Design a protein around this ligand. Structure first.
Ligand SMILES: *[C@@H]1O[C@H](CO)[C@@H](O[C@@H]2O[C@H](CO)[C@@H](O)[C@H](O)[C@H]2NC(C)=O)[C@H](O)[C@H]1NC(C)=O
Ligand SMILES: *[C@@H]1O[C@H](CO)[C@@H](O[C@@H]2O[C@H](CO)[C@@H](O)[C@H](O)[C@H]2NC(C)=O)[C@H](O)[C@H]1NC(C)=O
Ligand SMILES: *[C@@H]1O[C@H](CO)[C@@H](O[C@@H]2O[C@H](CO)[C@@H](O)[C@H](O)[C@H]2NC(C)=O)[C@H](O)[C@H]1NC(C)=O
Ligand SMILES: *[C@@H]1O[C@H](CO)[C@@H](O)[C@H](O)[C@H]1NC(C)=O
Lengths: 436, 121, 119, 438
């Protein structure tokens, strides 16, 4: 059998100040236990007495015995002074029920209730169940109720009486994954230079876990961390990674990686480390070009270079060229490695052909490329009488061809007239002499 | 462990001290001998008491949007200490007498309490 | 007149009222019936009393570099309240009593707004 | 002249002792009593008190029928309160000032002045006592501003201190006010809203500042902002506006400030116009000669208000375009001179003709025209009929043909033969050689 407690009723009221006297009748007596809230006490006498007053005595009394036997009795000490016993701690996990420790020292009251501070009314959605032995319980605590502040309240003699004051706090359950962003995108460096890259995380909570790791290896690198709380349920972290001095081995994928109890995400970036620097050149047109008098031509180069260009120059026939040319990057992106220059020859006069050359410099390399130029000219023609033979003389790049009816061509001949005519792709011209 | 829960904001504590009247009074239950004994004895009770006292103090000011009101700073510090409480209650897994402090001293007690985590079993 | 000694710093007073504990206590040697007409009788004594109490409130805080501070705002209030004493005393002890800041500053602003209308 | 009992130059009395007097005259009028602010007059020629309080301490004066008078000054020993104090203190820069620290028990020594919170006094405050009242400070100077003082005696070898005094000083003006205006000068089309600001910086709020319409005596409407920027550093801004300008509002406006050291003034000018305008100046003569393959540029300075809103170039009524630059002629804050140039390089012969440049703004549009002749060396030709040799040349100027062996000219001349025509115009030379054989 369990042990018998005298008197055997479930519950007892006692005056503040009155004596409290409880006996447990079992051959197997072992123990007395006393519990309220988190306070706890034990006794090894088989009888429990306390002549003095304390309200705090209120709560639960338990007796236990040899074969395993146990019985309990519950007790009130009615105090007009102390209607509640209280504990100002209050915390809830999102989406679970939560308990407010304001259990009642005298059960003979009604309209046992929960109420909002300073007159302000409680949000409508709360539903809660009371109990005098525990205090009062709030269902399904949800993110609206954060920092909400509370009284629990009772009516005695029609007068309405209030607990000491409570502030509720809620800690969130993750509905969604971390959010991950990286300071700049992809990196290229001349050897033996410091390398520094930053990764940033926005998330609901300070509990989030985040790391840097290098592709194909699990050595965690050294990293340094900084954080801010931008308001409720709003947490931010930044992490920075550094290599003081690059060696070419350092090239490859790097990954910023984040995790919480809902799932995960990353961002990747790639570093290329190069030993030295280069300039590489491509013409937009064939290197040698053919153009008519007063015609117009533009010459173009596209080139890839690192480090950045030091100067471009444009020069002709042991002489300068000046102020008829443009040079600008092929793209505005931070990544930009590629560059173009164009140079105009316009209303080109017929003798100015020859060789046009472009030169470019950077810190490590110099590179030069040349174009050659020949002029389409309409035939230009002239006459010289030699002995008995009459000669017809004409020049143009490319050669003129002649009929009777710079390259130089000559034609020699064996009432009315001698007409001598030459044609080229560029134009035609002619000569006249006559006999009577 | 837990060291990452203390965001860097704590530097603001020096600003906050300067703007409170040097004879305003702040009220704390103070663990006796906590100045003396090794950290791991007192720290558990202390960190609870701080969170309580601070949430009381927060009622006293009023928010404004412009700049750094005292109300802003205090609101953030509360968010730090509560998650330390959870971290200890979940990773480590009697009430002193009430006491009064001037601002400078009180914050000193707080600041040393934070420092105890930068190396803790 | 003296309508020019009052620089526009006073607008800061509403900021200052926010940044002080609502239960802190301030001590002022209050003219009885300053809550009633006319202006002119109480205004003369009142500006003197105000200068004293403000001076001691300035003694509390400490100076700080970056962003506004209570100290900074209070200082400019003292400079104004002094100039008005020089103006009234060269143009023209009630009991010590205790106020929370909101009550006190209600008094202060009413006192300033008595100027910009005068003999 | 009056007689007072007892007849010493003072009396010294225990706390609580009844204080007893008669002012002895047939010419009695009153007793007159005061110290600090507090003052009393009473009609009894005896003067009597039930029990001496510290507050009775001070000067008493027997008041009589000639206005002949006599005075006796009275002290009470009272071991709680050696000092009586007035807390208020103010000093005019460089005068002396008196510190309200009169003494109740004139039997103590070493009586002197000391810093708050144990700090030292700055070394220069030479100071003088008079225990009848106060301590005096000479020649107050601006470094003492909001300094803090205690007032002190050695007594029984103990050291005894007043409550705090805090010392605040009024500046006196070394220099004249310093003045700046928001921008120098203005032009407006009629009716626009017009607004200006003037700025003053000085040591005090008591600087005086006004705006006057130039050569007119009457004050205009103005509105104010001011800040104390810390100690001895005060700033004022004043703003003046006319909501809508009639033309007669043109002229000059002045901002003017005065202070006991002197005066400073700054001035600004305004012109209001009934309409916009545009005006144009060429670089070069309207009509211009060039030669084939040379280069020429066409250049205009023009001034306009409001700003230029369309600019266009056309040649032979068609848009010859995109060899031209245009820019404001100056970078000064109110420049309205504008320059454009148009640049022509390796001009070809047939292209001679007509060129026009044109501007509009909202109010007005205006256009200017140029005509150009490119000269060339002559071309030449040969014809014949009726046994005439015909030689025909065209160019610029009219070319000249000599025979030896678009301006247009011709000529003719009537066994084996070679004869020729050899020619130049101003621009150049060409030769035409004939051969006609039996
Ligand atoms: C995300 O989070 C947890 C930790 O919060 C990861 O747990 C791993 O646990 C083992 C030991 O049991 C550790 O050695 C690992 O370091 C942890 N993993 C990582 C990547 O650090 C868990 O593996 C992560 N993934 C998921 C789905 O939860
Ligand atoms: C970031 O973490 C996960 C797991 O490594 C990767 O998830 C992959 O994403 C792509 C695109 O959605 C899918 O096609 C794959 O099936 C996912 N699983 C795997 C094993 O790749 C994610 O892409 C990761 N990192 C990188 C560099 O992609
Ligand atoms: C307005 O400004 C000018 C320059 O500050 C002042 O012009 C001087 O006036 C005095 C006579 O009053 C002349 O002797 C000076 O030669 C003038 N020039 C300078 C540089 O001093 C003028 O006095 C001012 N007027 C007012 C009313 O302020
Ligand atoms: C200053 O202001 C008033 C008004 O113009 C004038 O009477 C006075 O002469 C001016 N100069 C000084 C030193 O006050």
């Amino acid at each position: 059998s369990p042990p018998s407690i005298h008197p055997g009723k479930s519950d007892l009221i006692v005056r503040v100040g009155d004596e409290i006297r409880l006996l447990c009748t079992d051959p197997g007596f072992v123990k007395w236990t006393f519990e309220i809230l988190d306070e706890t006490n034990e006794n090894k006498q088989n009888e429990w007495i306390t002549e003095k007053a304390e309200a705090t005595n209120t709560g639960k009394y338990t007796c236990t015995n040899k074969h395993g036997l146990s019985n309990s009795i519950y007790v009130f000490v009615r105090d007009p002074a102390k209607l509640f016993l209280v504990d100002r701690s209050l915390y809830g996990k999102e989406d679970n029920d939560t308990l407010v420790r304001c259990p009642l020292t005298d059960p003979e009251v009604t309209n046992y209730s929960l109420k909002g501070c300073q007159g302000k009314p409680l949000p409508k959605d709360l539903r809660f169940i009371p109990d005098p032995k525990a205090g009062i319980m709030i269902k399904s605590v949800k993110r609206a109720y954060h920092r909400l502040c509370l009284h629990c309240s009772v009516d005695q003699e029609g007068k309405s009486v209030l607990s000491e004051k409570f502030i509720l706090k809620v800690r969130p359950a993750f509905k969604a994954v971390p959010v991950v962003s990286v300071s700049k995108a992809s990196y290229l460096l001349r050897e033996g230079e410091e390398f520094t890259v930053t990764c940033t995380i926005k998330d609901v909570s300070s509990s989030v876990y985040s790391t840097w790791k290098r592709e194909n290896s699990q050595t965690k690198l050294q990293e340094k961390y900084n954080s801010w709380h931008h308001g409720d349920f709003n947490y931010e972290r930044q992490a920075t990674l550094t290599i003081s001095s690059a060696r070419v081995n350092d090239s490859g994928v790097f990954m910023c990686y984040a995790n919480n109890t809902f799932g995960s995400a990353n961002v990747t970036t790639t570093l290329e480390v190069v030993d030295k620097g280069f300039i590489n050149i491509f013409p937009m047109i064939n290197t040698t070009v053919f153009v008519n008098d007063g015609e117009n031509v533009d010459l173009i180069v596209e080139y890839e270079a690192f480090p950045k260009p030091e100067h471009q120059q444009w020069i002709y026939m042991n002489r300068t060229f000046t102020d008829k040319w443009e040079d600008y990057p092929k793209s505005e992106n931070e990544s930009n490695i590629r560059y173009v220059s164009e140079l105009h020859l316009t209303r080109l006069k017929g003798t100015e052909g020859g060789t046009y050359t472009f030169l470019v410099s950077n810190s490590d390399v110099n590179a030069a490329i040349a174009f050659n130029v020949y002029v389409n000219t309409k035939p230009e023609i002239l006459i010289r009488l030699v002995n008995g033979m009459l000669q017809c003389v004409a020049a143009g790049f490319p050669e003129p061809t002649i009929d009777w009816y710079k390259l130089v061509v000559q034609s020699s001949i064996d009432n009315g007239t001698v007409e001598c005519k030459a044609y080229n792709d560029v134009g035609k011209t002619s000569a006249y002499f006559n006999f009577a | 462990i837990c060291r990452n829960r203390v965001t860097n904001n704590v530097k603001d504590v020096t600003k906050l001290v300067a703007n409170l009247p040097k004879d305003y009074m702040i009220t704390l239950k103070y663990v006796p001998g906590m100045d003396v004994l090794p950290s791991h004895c007192w720290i558990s009770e202390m960190v609870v008491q701080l969170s309580d006292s601070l949430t009381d103090l927060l009622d006293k000011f009023s928010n404004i949007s412009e700049g750094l009101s005292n109300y802003s700073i205090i609101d953030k510090l509360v968010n730090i200490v509560d998650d330390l409480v959870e971290c200890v209650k979940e990773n480590s897994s009697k009430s002193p007498e009430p006491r009064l402090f001037t601002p400078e001293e009180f914050f000193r007690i707080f600041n040393r309490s934070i420092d105890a985590f930068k190396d803790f079993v």
